[PDB]
Structures are given as structure tokens and as C-alpha cells.
Amino acid sequence: TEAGLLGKNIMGTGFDFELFVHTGAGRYICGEETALINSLEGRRANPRSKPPFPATSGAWGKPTCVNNVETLCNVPAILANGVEWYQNISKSKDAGTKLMGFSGRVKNPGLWELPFGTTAREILEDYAGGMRDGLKFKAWQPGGAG
Amino acid sequence: ATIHVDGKEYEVNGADNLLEACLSLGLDIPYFCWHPALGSVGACRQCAVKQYQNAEDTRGRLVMSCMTPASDGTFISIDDEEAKQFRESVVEWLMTNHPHDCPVCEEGGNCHLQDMTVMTGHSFRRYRFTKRTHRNQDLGPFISHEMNRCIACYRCVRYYKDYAGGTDLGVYGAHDNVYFGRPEDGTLESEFSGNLVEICPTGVFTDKTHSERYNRKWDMQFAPSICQQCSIGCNISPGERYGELRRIENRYNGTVNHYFLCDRGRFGYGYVNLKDRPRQPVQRRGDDFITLNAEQAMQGAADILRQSKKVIGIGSPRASVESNFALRELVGEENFYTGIAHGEQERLQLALKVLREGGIYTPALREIESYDAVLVLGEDVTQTGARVALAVRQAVKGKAREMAAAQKVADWQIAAILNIGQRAKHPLFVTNVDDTRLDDIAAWTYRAPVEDQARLGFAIAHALDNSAPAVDGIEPELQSKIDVIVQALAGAKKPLIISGTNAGSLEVIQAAANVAKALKGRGADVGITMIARSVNSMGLGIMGGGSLEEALTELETGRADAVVVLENDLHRHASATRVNAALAKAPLVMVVDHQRTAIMENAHLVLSAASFAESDGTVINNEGRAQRFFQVYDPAYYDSKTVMLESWRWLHSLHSTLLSREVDWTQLDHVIDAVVAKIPELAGIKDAAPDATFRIRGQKLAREPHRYSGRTAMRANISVHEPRQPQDIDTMFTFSMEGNNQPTAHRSQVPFAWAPGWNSPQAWNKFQDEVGGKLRFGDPGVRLFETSENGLDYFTSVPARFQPQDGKWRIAPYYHLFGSDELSQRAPVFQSRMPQPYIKLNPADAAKLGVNAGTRVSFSYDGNTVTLPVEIAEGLTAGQVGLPMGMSGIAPVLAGAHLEDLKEA
Amino acid sequence: AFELSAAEREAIEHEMHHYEDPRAASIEALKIVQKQRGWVPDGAIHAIADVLGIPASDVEGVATFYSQIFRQPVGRHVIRYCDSVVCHINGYQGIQAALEKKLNIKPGQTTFDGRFTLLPTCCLGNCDKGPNMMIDEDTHAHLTPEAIPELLERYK
């Protein structure tokens, strides 16, 4: 907003947009999108039923779209470098890159940016360095606790 | 729409969800979190059915039927094995933490959770771990709290908050420690908190008044009666046991009071069980009180009446139509006096003239919820007609309903409706002498004297229609608010104007009639509602007669030497000193009453009348609907020395013994036919209920359930020989189980709801054609008058502004739901709930007198210096003093009355 | 007896400026009261209710719903050890045992002087550096049981 990128008359186009940061109070169910809308309204984070979708009536009965941080991070890359660049990142049905990484008693527990279609053994061996010393691999969860 | 349930075709309404459509067809789907009045939220997951995409589908999918619309060509299955196993699993998961409490729980035999545990066929416990527990809160004198029994169905919070508008009940906690209650211990603030005992499907919220003298539902004797605590006329089921009134359940009337009562009706029944009630006729002989039976009391009373030269009768709005008519027949039409003040009778007659001659349709209580704008003029409905306030809240939420319907959201998906309609609501404009309980949802609240409220109404009528008389002296900001009201009411498809006789002002009713006429002239679908004071106020107004002041002058001048007072204490309608002087001057006072009143000290004869629980009769409610209430129990069954008859029976036998020197304990239908023949305006009360010859395939209607217990032991302490069953010649009901209470029986009067497998209040679903709709074969009750073709004229009597004059003090009425009704005051459980009487004063007036908040001031009216402690009322207008009406010594005839000698004690 | 301060009321009203409905500032109002006074007392619910124009039952339900809004008195410092799955893999149980040995309490309650209170918490979003522990404003990673006395001695 100091540089005019947010607020009234952004970039001289007449478009007004105000961005706020709402810090949560520590509950896991608040990540659910309708429950996120409910907790944004200062209510208990009970999720809502669909239909109606949040696009029809979400936050305070208004049209509302909820998106992840990473999706809104790939949005500027699409809008800057082009669409046909984004479809040609990987030869997979899931276009674009993704933040992947193995964690838990491995040699290199971290996070890297890989195209879709990368096999899980590549992330474990070529990036995480495999398991730690004297540990036999038993199982793995691809996408967290759920 | 067309659905296919278990391979069988059904024709339903497409706007309903699947659960209510299937319950309307007689199919049994277990459910907890859905209610016909509250909508669907899909919490409890009990209503699961299996839905298929088409007829040639085998896999299907589990869906919640309460959240699934009953669209055309919808293929489902209830008796699918997977759906049955899931419903059993839901009941089992609810049963893992449930306390081993059924023998010591007041909901046993009336429990929806018991019914659905049995209905799912779940009876083997494979859970071996610990069960969670909770502390209980104190919710006041009415509702008992037991949080262990909760199943987290969220019905209480949805009803109390989204429906009733209450604020102090809520859901706290988290994952499996969800708590339902108040944030701290204290009385539930809502006037409709008592419906939680029927909303809650478990034993969390229970009737504490019933829990004192608890008995199970199969042990009750029920009757279909009408609540006697105000003029709305809500249908109730009084249930008794061992000769005392035990409980008041809601009785479903789809036209009036469908699922909900108010707390005054539900809990103010304790006056029936008072031990100082008259149970035998008592004659005064010097200082001796001789107890008589029926025959000798009738003989002596008729002899003394025959030696008298003129007998006058003083009726009451508490008494039924038949008893008032019987008194009118006994004393003569010209000698019959309605036992209300001249101003009260004038306001009542004007309200009746507006209702049955104004050409504007008066809605039923259920139909109020469909109006688009509400203007309440001078009537504190939450304290006088509370169910009208609940219906007004529903009509206010109608705007959110319409906004959701504009987005193609179904009417049963209540969460989406409340989400779309965030705070947008239909316009509500309430006027009172102070703040009302509808101010949280009112678009505007006008705190002003009754003359100023009437002037506001006349200004609204003038701005809506220039033919109406104008008001001179309107402030510009008041004119702007009047214009806001005018554009809100003119833009409404169905405006509703509510007023009543409790304001104590004729001009308020005249202004409301003017507003309704102005809206009618513009082509709007306007409705008008008038809130009376007592249960049969409209019936007494239709019957007519003189005022109480005329009867008092007749007693004082010596023209009348005999007075028969029917169900009237005479102190709520006139000054106590003048009433006592007139009754002491009269050589014969005969009080036919069921409550120990103060006028029986000087009464020569006291006839032990029956209350509503021990009598039959007809009552006309505030919208002019005749409703028949039936006797619940015979008072002579347990105490054989009790001579307690109907008031119309007493007066008809007195008339017969006065004429032919012979008693005649008549029948109810004879008195009904006499009313219909003599009074053509009350000709509709014949059709309120069928006569005593009405049968369902040759058998009567049962008052008690099939499993009524202890029939050879309840009276065994008196005598081991079983007494004769009490015969009911007046009505079609029997004082036994030997009768019909089938939900498919062709009748409208239903004493209680019970179907096999449905022992809870959810059996009313079985007793309706569609759930949440009307009673099958029609709701009981008949409107007396139709809407007139031509209306009245504009009332040109526009009052002047309220002028605060020194020395005088205008009494502003402050009604209380617990304390303004006389019989409700007599109930012992209301004494803790009712507040200490506070005299309400403006801060400016209290500074003028120098009195602070809490100090006692003494004032004299009719030579009676009484003292009250001061409460400061900021919303009151200076020059007015607020008085709580109906309380100890403060009669309701003080509304609009001046006051002298307001000084600090 | 609970009186809101002027700074608390100003911050609460400034948070009400950010939304189109004053109810939406209930979580931040409770967090402001908790940050100023350590926790949220019983009168704070009614004070926030009168400020925001929403019923006290709603504020109580919000305060009891969320785990980080404390409705009981806590110590001057809060230990929040992550009990989730990745820190369980990296051995949070030794960290919890060391904390129970040092504080000489069970999780959930407070020390006799109110110096620390111990709380099992959700996943802190630092699973690649597990196990993790949150003191009042500071996150700590790569925990060892021997580092508990030297880490807890810097919080008085």
C-alpha cells in the first residue's frame, strides 16, 4: 500500500482491493474452507454443508473463494510467464510445479520444488538422501496425517 | 414430485426434504437433529437412507434424508441393510457415553432417544470403556439440567437462538466435550425456554415443576384443553395423576400454537393444585361455616334468591362462554354485568368492533409468521401475548427466508438461509412506554406515552392515506422516523398491525385501526391482530352486558339485594375499598369460584366451582376462534367428599331450582344449544367440538394411555374395593383407557400423542397429514366471524400530546409474563420466578423527588397509601411513573390512571 | 469484576473496523484480552459481548472452542510441546518426559509458583526440524532431552 499496489485505485485501473491478515486461535478444523469461513466470521469453526457452495454464498452470505497459499503462489507465474509455459513445465496431466518433500528420520528432511510425476523414490533418495543410518524403511504417508 | 421408497411409488411435495416427505407417508426413519419447525442441519447423521441414481442401480450411496430434497423421480431405500447398519451404528455411538439413567430420568417413557434406540434394534453393548460425564447447571425454577444425557443433536441451541431469539443458551467446548447451557448458572432468560423440554430428545432439559411430583407418561390422564393464562388460546394437554394436575404438555394445533407454548402457559398451572381451593359449598351462618352437599346448597341458595327482589350477576373473562351464559340466564340479560371496568370494556368492545367489522382479516397465530412487516402499537406482546411475539420473530426472519429462496435454496436448509440472510430482516416497529423484549430485532422502538403512540399511529395512517385525520405537532426527526415506517409498510406485500387492550388506551386501538384501514385502501394484504387480556375476554365482549361500575352502583344504591359473582375476584377490575363496601352492603353475596379469593370473607355462599382441569367449556381467543376445553379428571374420584362442579352446571341447577324447586344437573350440549339459540353471535361454538354422542367406530375417545397402571391400587389405601369409573356425560371422552386415540381416527381433538414406537412428543408427526403442517382431519377450533365486506371509518379523535402536569402522575403499565395473570400468580413456582415489585421512575423525575435507585416511596390511590422501591427507567417518559400490573395490590385497571401524593416513605 | 482497559477497547474497535460484521472480531478480541492479562477471565466474556454487540454465550462458545484461548489461569510462561505424528517419529516422548521431570507436573496444569504451565499442542508446521516446542512467542526445533534444562532456564 505504500507503493500503491494495494488499496484504492490500484495501478491507475480504478480497482479497489484491501488485504487483511486474520491470525487464528489454534484449531485444526479451521483449515476446512467452510469452517474457515465460519471462523473468519468469528463463530465456532463448524463446517457448512454444500450445496450452496462458498462461491454462491460464502463469507457473510457474499460470494467468496477460498484458496491455498501455494495456489495463489503459482497464480503470478501463470499470469507473468504465460499459460503455454505453465502447461509445458512437465509432461503430466497435473500441470505446474509442486512443493514436495520427505520428512521423518531421513538424512535430509526438507522441502523442494518438483514437477508433477516425480516418483516418491526420487524425493526420498536423490533429495532426502534416503533413511538415516541403521534404519529400515517400513512405510510412508504421501500427503500428511490425513 | 415422485419418489420410489423400497420399490414402492409415492407422490410427495418436491419442496420438502426426504425425511419429512417420508415421515408424512408413515415411513419410519430414525432422526435426532431435525425438527419440523427448526429445519435441517444434518448433525446427528441418524436419518441416513440409501439413494440410487436410477431404477437400475444397485450400489447407491448413503445420504442424510433430512438434507436430501424430495425431487421428482428419486429412488431411495430405508430398509437397505447398509443404511440399517449405519443407523444402528449411529445409535450405538450415541449410546457409548450415555448414562445408565433411565429409571431415575424424567424423560423415561417419553424419550425420543429411547424410541430410536429401540427402533434401530440396537440392544447389545460392545463398548467396554469409560463414559464421559459433565457437571450440571442451575437453569432456574422451571428447567432442570442434566448434561450427561446429551447426544449433541444441537436442537436446543437452534431453537433457543435461531428460533426463540434467546441469547443466554449456547454450545461450548469442543470435539466430544460439547456443552449445551448457559455460560454461568442462572435462570434462562427467554419467555419460551420451557419448550426445551419437548425440543430436547433426551433428558437434559426437563420440567422441574413436573419433576417435583413426577409420574411417567403412561400413568397420566390427559385431556385436550385450552390454556387459560392469556387470550391467545394455545392448545394444551393437561396431564394429571392422583387427583392433582401434574404437567402441561403442548398440544399440536397447526392453526394456532403448533409446537410451542410460552412459559406462563407451560408452568403457571400450579394454582389448580392449591390446598386452599374450595372443594365443598360453604354457607355462612353468623360466624359458622357450614359445609353443604350439592342438593342442600342449591335449595338454600334458590330459596334465598327467591326471597330477594333483584339478583344481579357479575361475570368474568376467566369464566367460559357457557358459565357466563348460565349466569346471564339465571339473573336475566338486563341484570347481567361483565365483571370488568368501563374503560376495559370500552377497549374490548372497540377491539371486537375492529376485528369483526373493520373489513380486515385477522390472522391466526400460525399465519402471523408469513407477514412481511409488523407494526406493534402500545402492546407489550412478549409479556401479554408471548406466542404472538414468537410468531413476529418468525415473520421477521421471513426476509432471510425470501432472500434464500431467491437463490434457489430450499426452505428446510436453515443454515444456508441464515447465512444468506445475515442480519437483513423484515421491518418491525414496536411502540411501548419503555423497552420491550422485541427490541433486539425491532427496526425501530418508540418509547412514549400511550397518547404519543396513538398520535404516531394516526400520523402513520395520515401519511399512508391523506383521507385519514392529520396530526399537528410532529417533530421533524419524529416525522423522518414516521416516513421510514411509512415507506417500510407501503412496500410490504403483507403488512401486519398488532395492538390490544393492555395498553389502557382507546386511541391506540383507534390509531391501529386507522393504519390498517389506510393499508387496506392502498391494496395491501394487511392483517390486524388484537391482544385481549384474559382467556375468554373476547367471549365476554361478544356476550356483552354492563360494566363492573354499573353493578357496584346497583349494589350501593340498594336496587340489587343479591349478587352472584362468577369466577371474579373483583379487585383486579375495581378499587378494593369500593368493592368491599358494596359487597358488605349487599345482604346476599354468592361467589361461584374455584380459587380462594378475598371476597369470600363477606360472601354468604361460596360455590366450589371447577377450574379448567376439572370442567368443560368453550373459550374465545384473541382472534375470535371458539375452542372447546375438556375435563381432565373427576375431582370426586380420589376424595369422595369433594363437591366440585362446573360453573355452568352450578348456575343452571340454581336456575332450575329457582324456577321449579328441583335441581337439574344438565349436560354440556344443552347449555351449548342454549347459547346458540339465545346468542346468534356465538353460534359458531356449536362446531368447536362434536357433542357427547361423537364416536370413533362406536367407541369414545380415551383420556389415558393403554398402559395406564395401578388401577386396582391407587385408591386401595382408602378402600380395597375398586370405585366406580367416573362417567362423562358432558363430552365424547371417557375417564379410562377404554377408548380411541388412534392417529388415523377421524377427529380433531387429540388428548395426547402416542403411536407404537413413538412415545416422545415426536408422535405428533404420526398425528398429522404432513409433518409440521395441520392436524389430520383439520385443526380444532372454529372462527366465529368472517371478514366483513365493508370496513369502518377513520377515527377522527386524534389525542393531544402527553402533558406532564405537576402533582399528577400517569401510570405506565409494566406487564410481566410471570406476575400479571392472577391464576399464574397463585402458582407457587411463579413466586421465585416473579420479580420484586419495583416502581419505575424517570431519572429526571427521581432527581426531582430526590429519590435514588432502591429507596421506598409511598403513593396513595383510592385512599390506599402503599410503598414500593424505586427502579430507574431511562426509557420512560418524564411525567410518567411505571407500575407492575397484576401484582400484589396493583390492579390492571391502573393503566392510564392518574396518581397523587408520590412521596418518599 | 472485570473492567476493560482503554487500549484493549481501542484495539478491539480497530479490529471491528476490518470486517463488515462486528462478530468477526470476537477471536481477535479474546486474543487481545489474553495477551494483555495472560488468559481470558469470566468477566472478559461479558465485556467483549457488550463491546461487540453479540451475546455472551457466543463469545463463551468461541473462547471454549479454540485451544489457544485460555479460560483458566495459567502461569507466566506456557510450554507447548508438539505431540503430533512427525515429532512422535522424532521422539517427542523423551522431550515430554524431560519436561515432566523438570517441572514436576503432569501436562495440562500449572506449577506451584505459576512459573510455567505445560501443554501438549497441535502440529507446529515445523515437522522437518522436529521435535518442536513453543514457548510463549518462541519456537524451538531439533530438541534433545538434555537441552530442556538449558532451554527452560532462560524463561523466568
Ligand SMILES: Cc1cc2nc3c(=O)[nH]c(=O)nc-3n(C[C@H](O)[C@H](O)[C@H](O)COP(=O)(O)O)c2cc1C
Ligand atoms: C479437516 C480439514 C483440514 C484442512 N486443512 C487445510 C489447511 O490447513 N490448509 C489448506 O490449504 N487446506 C486445508 N484443507 C482443505 C480445504 O478444505 C480446501 O480444500 C483448501 O483450503 C482450498 O482448496 P485449494 O487447494 O483449491 O486451494 C482442509 C480440509 C479438511 C477437511
Ligand code: SF4
Ligand atoms: S434421556 Fe432417554 S435414554 Fe437417556 S437416561 Fe433418560 S430416558 Fe434413558
Ligand code: SF4
Ligand atoms: S441438550 Fe438436548 S437438544 Fe441440546 S444438543 Fe443435547 S440432546 Fe440435543
Ligand code: SF4
Ligand atoms: S401465549 Fe398465552 S395462551 Fe399461549 S401458552 Fe402463553 S399464556 Fe397460554
Ligand code: FES
Ligand atoms: S435428522 Fe438428518 S442428520 Fe439429523
Ligand code: FES
Ligand atoms: S508434527 Fe510436530 S511440528 Fe509438525
Ligand SMILES: [Ca+2]
Ligand atoms: Ca364434565
